Design a protein around this nucleic acid. Structure first.
Lengths: 215, 226
RNA sequence: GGCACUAUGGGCGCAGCGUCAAUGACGCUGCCGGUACACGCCAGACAAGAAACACUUGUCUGAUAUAGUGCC
């Protein structure tokens, strides 16, 4: 039916001068019609490799493509600062054409604990019938971080949204926001509003909370 | 350098509307190439969509677009097209056209890509944001720095711009990617870390501009004290 | 994949009609059956043509060719 391309790893944390190998695994024979691309944010993808192994004209020679059966790997021999981007494989052996899910190559750095803050809703917002509680994780590394909402020690589910900034240009930390959305009616049916954060730089999960109604 | 794909035609349309995207080619005669359309939903990866082969006009499609999209090419206008009919919100993405290289030089790789054109499918109507203080607190605030911010809530479509202090304050500001809420309106929030000794002494104002609704808003973020 | 047996008027029976289809199915009816070979012709596969498919051209293969079942 359709051919599946499955990439590996989906994100990768390396420092300059590393050997980086990205691998992508095909579900049927694609022969050698695999292409690799580099995409940077906001920008069109750029061709790096064609025919699974061939160096596209103008691309640095530190990029190489390899083939092994249905298992294709792009390896960047020596990482450069302009090479932190997202990379994609592609099969064009048959239609539909299929792209791997993507690999994001990111800046390694020392662990930085997320400095955490919780913000209760404005009385102005309650006039709108909705209430948002915001939990902020500031300047942390690595990106992986679990934010867990609790209202009176009861976890919430399906009523929060996250959003992460890209890796900061200067200290290459991340920052993340989590927004718990509630009706005002449900908001005042409770007192203790809490944010729980697990991160590699946190010895044990850190928790910030407030009680609804503090002057 | 001299090869160039210049896309146009994206925009905002209600679900079930249609849109004709265009990819004008320069630097080459379009008829001797396969032209592909690739799309990318916000935050997702690349998804091939439709392609057309040279000398025959043969067209191919992704199952997710089969029957609704039509890739075509006018060689007299040296331009490829993608008619999208009965559009659905899952179809929202940045739409790329790409050229399949010459077989001998770059295999079947797409060597040149258009600039991107944005397609938004939504039944939401335009709404300016409501701006809400993310006020800092009295507790903790023991790290020499405190954090404060603005909640930019319930707008459509993107984008807003958020400055602080009319652009004066930028160091340590984080403005997150907007998320689309289940209501189909968007929200982001802008936060800034500041010296915790300035809270009552220093005024912090977030300025939110939402061009589509012609709304500029300035919000003063004040402490609450006890 | 290998092994085993099993089946195949042009590899191209000669035709007709209904053909539906969307490229997935064809079929009945008639007609006549030296043999290879040479071709043609068609169909595969391969390359090349600005060329994934179609197209054009070249080369090759259709007897050790396609078609099943069992074994492994």
């Amino acid at each position: 039916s359709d051919i599946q391309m499955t990439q590996s790893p989906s994100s990768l944390s390396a420092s300059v001068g590393d050997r980086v190998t990205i691998t992508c695994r095909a579900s049927q024979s694609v022969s050698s019609a695999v292409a690799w691309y580099q995409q940077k944010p906001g920008k069109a993808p750029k061709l790096l490799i064609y025919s699974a192994s061939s160096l596209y004209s103008g691309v640095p020679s530190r990029f190489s493509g390899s083939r092994s059966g249905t298992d294709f790997t792009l390896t960047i021999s020596s990482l450069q600062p302009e090479d932190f981007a997202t990379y994609y494989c592609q099969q064009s052996y048959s239609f539909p054409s299929t792209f791997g899910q993507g690999t994001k190559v990111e800046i390694k750095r020392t662990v930085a604990a997320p400095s955490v803050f919780i913000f209760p809703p404005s009385d102005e917002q309650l006039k709108s019938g909705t209430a948002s509680v915001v939990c902020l994780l500031n300047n942390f590394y690595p990106r992986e971080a679990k934010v867990q909402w609790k209202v009176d020690n009861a976890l919430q589910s399906g009523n929060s949204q996250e959003s992460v900034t890209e890796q900061d240009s200067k200290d290459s930390t991340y920052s993340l926001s989590s927004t718990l959305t509630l009706s005002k009616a449900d908001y005042e049916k409770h007192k203790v509003y809490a944010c729980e954060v697990t991160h590699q730089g946190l010895s044990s999960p850190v928790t910030k909370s407030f009680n609804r109604g503090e002057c | 350098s001299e090869v160039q794909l210049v896309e146009s035609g994206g925009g905002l349309v209600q679900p079930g509307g249609s849109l004709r995207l265009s990819c004008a080619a320069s630097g080459f005669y379009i008829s001797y190439s396969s032209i592909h359309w690739v799309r990318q939903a916000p935050g997702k990866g690349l998804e091939w969509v439709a392609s057309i082969s040279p000398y025959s006009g043969s067209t191919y499609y992704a199952d997710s677009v089969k029957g609704r999209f039509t890739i075509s090419a006018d060689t007299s206008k040296n331009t490829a097209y993608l008619q999208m009919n009965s559009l659905r919100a899952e179809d929202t993405a940045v739409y790329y056209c790409a050229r399949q290289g010459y077989r001998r030089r770059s295999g079947r790789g797409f060597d040149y890509w258009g600039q991107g054109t944005l397609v938004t499918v939504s039944s939401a109507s335009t709404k300016g944001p409501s701006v809400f203080p993310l006020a800092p607190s009295s507790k903790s605030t023991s790290g020499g720095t405190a954090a404060l911010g603005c909640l930019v809530k319930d707008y459509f479509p993107e984008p807003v711009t958020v400055s602080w202090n009319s652009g004066a304050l930028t160091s340590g500001v984080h403005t997150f990617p907007a998320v689309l809420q289940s209501s189909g309106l968007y929200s982001l929030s802008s936060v800034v870390t500041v010296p915790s000794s300035s809270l009552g002494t220093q005024t912090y104002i977030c300025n939110v501009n939402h061009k589509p609704s012609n709304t500029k808003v300035d919000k003063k973020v004040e402490p609450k004290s006890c």
